Amino acid sequence: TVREWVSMAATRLEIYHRFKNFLRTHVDEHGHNVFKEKISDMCKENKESLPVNYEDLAAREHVLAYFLPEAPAEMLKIFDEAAKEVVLVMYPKYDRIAREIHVRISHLPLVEELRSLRQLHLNQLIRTSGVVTCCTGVLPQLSMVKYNCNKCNFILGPFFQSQNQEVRPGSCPECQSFGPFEINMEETVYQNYQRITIQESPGKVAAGRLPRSKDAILLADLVDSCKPGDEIELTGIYHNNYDGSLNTANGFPVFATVILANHITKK
Amino acid sequence: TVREWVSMAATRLEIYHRFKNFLRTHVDEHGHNVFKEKISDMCKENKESLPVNYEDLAAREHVLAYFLPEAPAEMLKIFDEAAKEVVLVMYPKYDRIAREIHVRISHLPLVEELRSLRQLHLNQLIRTSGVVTCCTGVLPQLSMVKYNCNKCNFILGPFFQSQNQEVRPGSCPECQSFGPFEINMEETVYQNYQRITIQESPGKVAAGRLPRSKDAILLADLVDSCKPGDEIELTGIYHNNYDGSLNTANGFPVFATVILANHITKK
Amino acid sequence: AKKSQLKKRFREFLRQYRIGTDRTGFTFKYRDELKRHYNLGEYWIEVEMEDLASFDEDLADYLYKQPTEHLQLLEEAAQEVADEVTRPRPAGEETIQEIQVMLRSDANPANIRSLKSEQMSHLVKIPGIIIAATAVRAKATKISIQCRSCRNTIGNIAVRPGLEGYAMPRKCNCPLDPYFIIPDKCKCVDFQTLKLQESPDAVPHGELPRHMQLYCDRYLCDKVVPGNRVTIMGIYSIRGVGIRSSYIRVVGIQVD
Amino acid sequence: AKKSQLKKRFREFLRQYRIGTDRTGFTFKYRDELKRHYNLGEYWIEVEMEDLASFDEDLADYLYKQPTEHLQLLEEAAQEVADEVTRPRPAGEETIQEIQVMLRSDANPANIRSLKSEQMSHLVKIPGIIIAATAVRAKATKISIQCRSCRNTIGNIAVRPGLEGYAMPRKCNCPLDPYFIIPDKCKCVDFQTLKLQESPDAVPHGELPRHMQLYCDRYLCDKVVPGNRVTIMGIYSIRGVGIRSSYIRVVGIQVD
Amino acid sequence: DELSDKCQKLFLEFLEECKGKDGSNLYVSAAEELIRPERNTLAVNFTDIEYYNQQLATTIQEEYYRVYPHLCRAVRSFARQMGNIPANKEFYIAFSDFPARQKIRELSSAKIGTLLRISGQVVRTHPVHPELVSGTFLCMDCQSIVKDVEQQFRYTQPTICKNPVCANRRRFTLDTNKSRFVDFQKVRIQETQAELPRGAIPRSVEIILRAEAVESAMAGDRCDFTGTLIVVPDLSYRLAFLACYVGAT
Amino acid sequence: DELSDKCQKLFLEFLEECKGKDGSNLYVSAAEELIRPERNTLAVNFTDIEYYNQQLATTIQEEYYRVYPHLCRAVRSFARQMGNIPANKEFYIAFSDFPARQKIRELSSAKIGTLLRISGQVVRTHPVHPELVSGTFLCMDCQSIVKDVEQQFRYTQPTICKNPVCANRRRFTLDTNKSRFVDFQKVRIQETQAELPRGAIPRSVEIILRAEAVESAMAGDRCDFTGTLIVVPDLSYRLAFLACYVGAT
Ligand SMILES: [Zn+2]
Ligand SMILES: [Zn+2]
Ligand SMILES: [Zn+2]
Ligand SMILES: [Zn+2]
Ligand SMILES: [Zn+2]
Ligand SMILES: [Zn+2]
Secondary structure, eight states, rough: HHHHHHTTTHHHHHHHHHHHHHHOOOOTTOOHHHHHHHHHHHHHHHOOOOEHHHHHHHHOOOOOOOTTTTTTHHHHHHHHHHHHHHHHHHTTTTTTTOOOEEEEEEOOOOOOGGGOOOGGGGSSSSEEEEEEEOOOOOOEEEEEEEEEOTOOOOOOEEEETTTTTTOOOOOOSSOOOSOOBBBOTTTOOEEEEEOOOOOOOOTSSSSSOOOEEEEEEEEGGGTTSSOTTEEEEEEEEEEEEOHHHHHHTTOBEEOOOEEEEEEEOOO | HHEEEESSHHHHHHHHHHHHHHHHBBBBBBBOBBHHHHHHHHHHHTTOOOEEHHHHHHOOOOOOHHTTTTSSHHHHHHHHHHHHHHHHHHHTTTTOSSSSOOOEEESOOOOOOOGGGOOTTTTTTEEEEEEEEEEOOOOEEEEEEEEOOTTOOEEEEEOOOOOSOOOOOOOOOOOOSSSSSSBOOTEEEEEEEEEEEEEEETSOOOSSSSSOOEEEEEGGGGGTTTTTOOOEEEEEEEEEEEOOHHHHHHHHBBBBEEHHHEEEEEO | OOHHHHHHHHHHHHHOOOSSSSTTTOOSSSHHHHHHHHHHHHOOOEEEEHHHHHHHHHHTTTTTOOHHHHHHHHHHHHHHHHEEEEEEEEOOOOSOOOOOEEEEEEOOOOGGGGGOOSSSSEEEEEEEEEEEEEEEEEEEEEEEEEEEESSEEEEEEESSSSOOOOOSSOOOOSSOEEEEEEEEEEEEEEEEEEEEEOTTSSSSTTTOOOOOEEEEEEGGGGGOOOTTTEEEEEEEEEEESOOOOOOOOOEEEEEO | HHHHHHHHHHHHHHHOEEOOOOOOOOOEHHOOOHHHHHHHOEEEEEEHHHHHHOOOEEEHHHTTHHHHHHHHHHHHHHHHHHHHTTTSTTTOOOOOOOOEEEEEOOOOOOOSSOSSSSSSSSSEEEEEEEEEEOOOEEEEEEEEEEESSSEEEEEEEEOSSOOOOOOOSSSOOSSSOOOEEEEEEEEEEEEEEEEEEEOTTOOTTOOOOEEEEEEGGGGTTTTOOOTTEEEEEEEEEEOOOOBBEEEEEEEEEOOO | OOOHHHHOOOOHHHHHOOTTOOBBBHHHHHHHHSSSSTEEEEEEHHHHHHHHHHHHHHHHHHHHHHHHHHHHHHHHHHHHHSOOOOOOOOEEEEOOOOOOOTTTTOOOTTTTTTTTEEEEEEEOEEEEEESSEEEEETTTTTTEEEEEEOOOOSSOOOOSSSSSOOOOOOOOEEESSSEEEEEEEEEEEOOOOOTTTTTOOOOOOOEEEEEOOOOOOOOOOHHHHHEEEEEEOOOOOEEEEEEEEEEOO | OHHHHHHHHHHHHHHHHOTTTOOOBBHHHHHHHHHTTTTTTTEEEEEHHHHHHHHHHHHHHHHHHHHHHHHHHHHHHHHHHHHHTTTTTTOEEEEOOOOOOOOOOOOOSTTTTTTTEEEEEEEEEOOOEEEEEEEEETTTTOOOEEEEOOOOOSSOOOOSSSSSOOOOSSSSEEEEESOOEEEEEEEEOOOTTTTOOOTTOOOOEEEEEETTTTOOOOOEEEEEEEEEEEEOOOOOOEEEEEEEEEEOO
16 A cells, blocks of 8 residues: 555655755756745745645656655645745744645646546545535634643643544543543634535536536635635545435445545636 | 464364363263263362363363363363353252362373473463472452442443453443442452462482472462472463562563462372 | 732732823823722723733733633722722622723724634634624523532532533532522623624625624623624634634624 | 331331240340440440341341441441430430440351351351450541641541541542541541451361451450450451452450 | 355356357456456356356346355456456446346335346436445454444444454444445336336336446436345335346347 | 674575585584474584684674674574474574683773673572563554564663554553563672682672573583673663573583
């Protein structure tokens, strides 16, 4: 599995160094350093999102360009860390205006349709297109929860939360008060949340068939980048989420599917 | 590993059936059923210990006679269960005078000495000889502790305890009060405990060498079967127990060794 | 503890702040206002934020970032100062009433669409227009409980302000959960909920305006009716997987 | 609960047991004895075990196997009966004293070497010879605790009889473990520990005699001196890995 | 179950030994395509099964639903031996050319578990959803992994551990990483006008589609569905059809 | 550490290529006995090592303690290739025929880590006890198994997990089933009368015995111990001798 190989510490460090070298040393057709200008424009307008084109990444690193579409989570995390390091080197004071630099992947060679997604595409970086039909408001979501212990008043460390399950607390050093654990509102870190709904294009839908739809999740800078009735090109991680209600309804164990959005382009 | 093979459910059932058949159908040189008389004598005097000779077990079941010296724990447990079933069949009312029938192995072909025991003999049924030097009194030991839950007043199920570690509680059905767990003194089950100390024989010790000694643990019917200054033949499971005090003393990580006694014969 | 030091610093701010120059004269501003309001029957004051910064910049900086505890300490300090200024009260009014502190500042207002998730539990200043309101219900502040079996009483329990409850004890100290709230032994205050809509000009093109739920308490109730333009100063707080509703505890209103 | 029913049955046993035949006459045995002892100043009675079996076999069978709770219920029943028999007490003696119940039976005695581990928390009858004793110390029965910081008081806490303590609370309901025992607000009883040695004839050949620790309380103290042959009736209980010391809570002594 | 084992061995022999006029194995060429991804279902003609062994064909028709898993296991071994493929890759059998046409009215409780063939007009379809075939259940008291826990048209979990220590009541977490997912679709068809008897409404039924046989038949298309009849869950029970092959005439 | 790898390869080549006058491999016949149980230590003459490669012999003498584990690993592969042997079985090297005799007084901090040879009279011995060479440590927060955790003359545990999630402070349980145990003995020897200088007491030292070299030398026997010198644990430190071979003249 590519996930196991990229999970290796030495492989992780090698990928980190390769991405740092790619960011620092990538000349253009005229020799200009593209990422210097990109980071300058990003920090000049107080953004926290850095776009990366897949074509030049493949041109300068084919191994990583092959690893990415198969393990899009850890690879993107390493890319984010390397980008943050490079930005901090270039702009030492940017730790005030931002706390995490995100990497957005553009021009992914593979393009699919909402009607041809099967279990083969699970946990893979896919690229689809469609028309937005629904857009909920921006709600806050728990990013890193800081559980406390009533037995000792000491507060446990951060616990990352995913969009697929409910995070549970760990173990206190010596007084094992697993039960009496709560959440404080002044140290927990939150993040923006928005769940859009995309459907097939009016022109591209088969006459005999009916339009299909899939749910997408937008977080952090991605929120409020779409409005209902807009044609978009969505790149994200196809993700599988259990839904017992559908199981009971259909009478057969079935799971819901959602897309964790990573890059959105409006055409 | 023989332990893994004998841990299989089908293998366990086959061994159980073979031992039951051996107990029920084992004629003597004159055709007399030896185990019928043995069980009659055991139940007549209100005992809970049934001796089994290794020679006839090998004669009637070589596979089990080979399995036993390599996995003496689970094999003996299965033997105990089969013996209890046979006794209950023969004497339906013996559940009052006893609650568990023990099997004692006699005439083990292998014989060793206290000076030639190494890590090769760990977790194996060994047979040694020596002279007793110390005998502590009979103290009660926790056999099956019944932990309770303060959150619900319901008491957890039995938890077996071994002579090598301290048993910890499990998980309550819904109210996870791991901390507030205690022990009641009227539903717990105890067992007798006695720790003898055996040493090398005065005549058999090498003139240049000095006498050696090893600790043995006696439980249930075995207690008060030895007195200081007695020559005995000890059969039991050679067992390894950690001892950090010896580690600190010697300056090197070392572990203590004890023998879980199974059969004791006085010569 | 540091809480006592903070309370003492707030008391010193209330007792020692003065306005004016020696060419005309000096008048204590918040002590006189506290005395006048307490004698009139209105138990509230309006404390500016530039004044507190000028007196003690650290104290102002601890109110823009951790408003809850510091505002509670400020209210307790105001109660103590008001008690000491009118110490010989007439017969029947020996007990000292609680004082509510309202905040105000001259900062540039933010937008509803600019409220990130980082600015949680921070003082914010957002304009808007009120489009809805609810009936004035009751919110408890002090409660007393009693066991159903052994009738043991645990009085003077305090309930946190805002849309936050109180988890009742399980052990009786008499089956599980034997405690019930005594009806007559409860002190309650006014309580209202509003809906703030984004200003008609800050709304982007081709998009419907957004909304935000507000919370008003005590003397802030029945101050704004639907259809008024207001500027709200309040505490951003929280009331799908891990999704929590977010409201705004209002601590100051400036009707336009 | 079943505890109330058991207590009522014990009270009925105490109030209704009679001895004799109609050819001579009937005399209530335990009610008269309770009245006489309470008036004399000795607060104890000696209840046989065959009498309780004859009155109610189930009640006797619940005392030979779960002595702790049933003996406590029997003592409470004895206290209530003694209170009702001498109801108009003289001035100054309104409060009713606690009664201690001692047991006796005619069963064949066991041996110290015959005490298995199955017979734990069961009434046993073992003879022997006393070879040691200790000074009469004090054992608490009712204690009252108080917080070190907020001086809250939690009185009338009951401590189980025997060599068993009381785990003090952690939460103050004021740092962790803020509770200390008030010295003068403690009720104590007498307390002694003995050592019973196996009889000189029951000892096997070529082996030293074994021993067993005993526990005596209230009127059982200072009844046996070293060098006496006794027959002890008591509760087998517990005070290496998992090894626990075992003693015998003595509830009756028959000095020979 | 020696019947299932014998059927599996005979089916494997049929796959590796069937030869037409050319005297060549067609199923080896079929598995050549099964090597590639996006392919997970094989094809076979029931008439050729009869030609090779009419007795085996009859045995298949007797307990088609019961012996289908073993047929899939055999075709898995055949494809894996033919070419290098991931072991986790599942395979399915599609039975075509079934002459035993049936009637919608003819369906009854006796026919449950036997291969059939029905015709109808597609009324409505449903979107494609993942389906959990065999789930991985883990004890919360000992962390023993119990894999390949089949789901019988309902969330089903055992009460025993993989290791002989625990017997957990209801605490069995599910791991999606070790689980098996197959495409699922739920279409509805009604009785055709020709089949319609006098004075009777069409008895519409529901059809379960899996594997590559998903999004195959559009609405209002006359199709012949070949598959078994099963019961989909006092015990509430309802009838349903699980078609393995869909054909249009 | 290419030095250790090169030493391992050269030692393996020496084991599989050393040939005396008969032109035959002695170490293959030695490993024939290592196939049997109760055998876990091999023998080798340092003079023959010099004959085969004096440079390799010098390299061994430089860092004997450092390169000894790799020598053991190489002899493990040699013995396992020679005959069927359980993988868990460990093997050890005993170095004999070392001409570089030393003095007890000569021992110093500079000589630590180098192969030496000393003589003395055995004073007292100790009973045989198990010794934990490499322990298995398990995190209590994620249950990740960290095997082959060497013990450096003390109970040593790491603070990191096998998987990159936890970093446990002190919660690392030890499993004896996956652990490695070797025989351990602690004897004491004193300086011989011949070595005794004028007006000086004998400087008795302690010797660590392992493997089959246990219960080898009785009390009051003049023996020559071949082994390295190590430091056995402000940082308290004391000297000790770890003899791999014991010989009597
Ligand atoms: Zn804690
Ligand atoms: Zn519970
Ligand atoms: Zn109560
Ligand atoms: Zn307190
Ligand atoms: Zn389990
Ligand atoms: Zn961990």
